[PDB]
Design a protein around this motif. Sequence first.
Motif, PDB file in Angstrom:
ATOM      1  N   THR A   9       0.825  -1.217   0.000  1.00  0.00           N
ATOM      2  CA  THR A   9       0.000   0.000   0.000  1.00  0.00           C
ATOM      3  C   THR A   9       0.864   1.274   0.000  1.00  0.00           C
ATOM      4  O   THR A   9       0.340   2.377  -0.186  1.00  0.00           O
ATOM      5  CB  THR A   9      -0.959   0.037   1.220  1.00  0.00           C
ATOM      6  N   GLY A  10       2.180   1.111   0.208  1.00  0.00           N
ATOM      7  CA  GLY A  10       3.096   2.249   0.232  1.00  0.00           C
ATOM      8  C   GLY A  10       3.255   2.832   1.627  1.00  0.00           C
ATOM      9  O   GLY A  10       3.203   4.053   1.806  1.00  0.00           O
ATOM     10  N   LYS A  11       3.449   1.946   2.605  1.00  0.00           N
ATOM     11  CA  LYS A  11       3.606   2.334   4.004  1.00  0.00           C
ATOM     12  C   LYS A  11       4.846   1.675   4.604  1.00  0.00           C
ATOM     13  O   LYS A  11       4.996   0.451   4.543  1.00  0.00           O
ATOM     14  CB  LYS A  11       2.365   1.914   4.794  1.00  0.00           C
ATOM     15  N   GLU A  12       5.744   2.493   5.167  1.00  0.00           N
ATOM     16  CA  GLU A  12       6.961   1.981   5.801  1.00  0.00           C
ATOM     17  C   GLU A  12       6.700   1.678   7.280  1.00  0.00           C
ATOM     18  O   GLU A  12       6.441   2.592   8.068  1.00  0.00           O
ATOM     19  CB  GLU A  12       8.118   2.984   5.654  1.00  0.00           C
ATOM     20  N   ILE A  13       6.793   0.389   7.645  1.00  0.00           N
ATOM     21  CA  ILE A  13       6.558  -0.069   9.024  1.00  0.00           C
ATOM     22  C   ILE A  13       7.875   0.034   9.813  1.00  0.00           C
ATOM     23  O   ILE A  13       8.947  -0.264   9.274  1.00  0.00           O
ATOM     24  CB  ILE A  13       6.085  -1.557   9.045  1.00  0.00           C
ATOM     25  N   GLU A  14       7.786   0.451  11.078  1.00  0.00           N
ATOM     26  CA  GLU A  14       8.969   0.593  11.930  1.00  0.00           C
ATOM     27  C   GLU A  14       9.048  -0.535  12.957  1.00  0.00           C
ATOM     28  O   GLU A  14       8.171  -0.665  13.817  1.00  0.00           O
ATOM     29  CB  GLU A  14       8.958   1.954  12.635  1.00  0.00           C
ATOM     30  N   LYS A  33       1.692  -6.512  14.319  1.00  0.00           N
ATOM     31  CA  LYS A  33       1.633  -5.066  14.059  1.00  0.00           C
ATOM     32  C   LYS A  33       0.529  -4.680  13.060  1.00  0.00           C
ATOM     33  O   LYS A  33      -0.232  -3.742  13.314  1.00  0.00           O
ATOM     34  CB  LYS A  33       2.977  -4.566  13.535  1.00  0.00           C
ATOM     35  N   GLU A  34       0.447  -5.405  11.932  1.00  0.00           N
ATOM     36  CA  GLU A  34      -0.542  -5.105  10.887  1.00  0.00           C
ATOM     37  C   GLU A  34      -1.787  -5.996  10.971  1.00  0.00           C
ATOM     38  O   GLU A  34      -2.898  -5.526  10.713  1.00  0.00           O
ATOM     39  CB  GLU A  34       0.100  -5.232   9.503  1.00  0.00           C
ATOM     40  N   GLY A  35      -1.599  -7.276  11.315  1.00  0.00           N
ATOM     41  CA  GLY A  35      -2.726  -8.198  11.421  1.00  0.00           C
ATOM     42  C   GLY A  35      -2.828  -9.171  10.254  1.00  0.00           C
ATOM     43  O   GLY A  35      -3.936  -9.529   9.846  1.00  0.00           O
TER      44      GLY A  35
END
Lengths: 76, 52
Positions: A9-14, A33-35
């Motif tokens: 989706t274009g999201k950088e997870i930390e 974290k995301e599911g």
Amino acid sequence: MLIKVKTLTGKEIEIDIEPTDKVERIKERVEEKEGIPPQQQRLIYSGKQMNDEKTAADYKILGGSVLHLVLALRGG
Amino acid sequence: GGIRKTRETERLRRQLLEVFWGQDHKVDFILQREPYCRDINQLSEALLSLNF
């Protein structure tokens, strides 16, 4: 050492993990974290595919590197 | 519809623990996705709670 993951989706997870840990363990951290399950999430770096039997150290990844993730589909 | 995620999302954000809207990365994630229910969560929760 901390690293950032890239989603479809274009999201950088930390996240924060060690280089001596296995790719599968990092996948579990993503699930909470995301599911989304780990078996449906792939991790790609440089251009090669990362296996659940290998570790982040095998791909010389260090705190500050951006890792890619691509698995599971919603549409068609 | 039937059920809404507004209650979990705002409650986290207001005083409770990071539930939908919360769950670390999830905080912004609810609206920045595709569904309407999540859309309201960050939209109404992240925007109103952070600003006001």
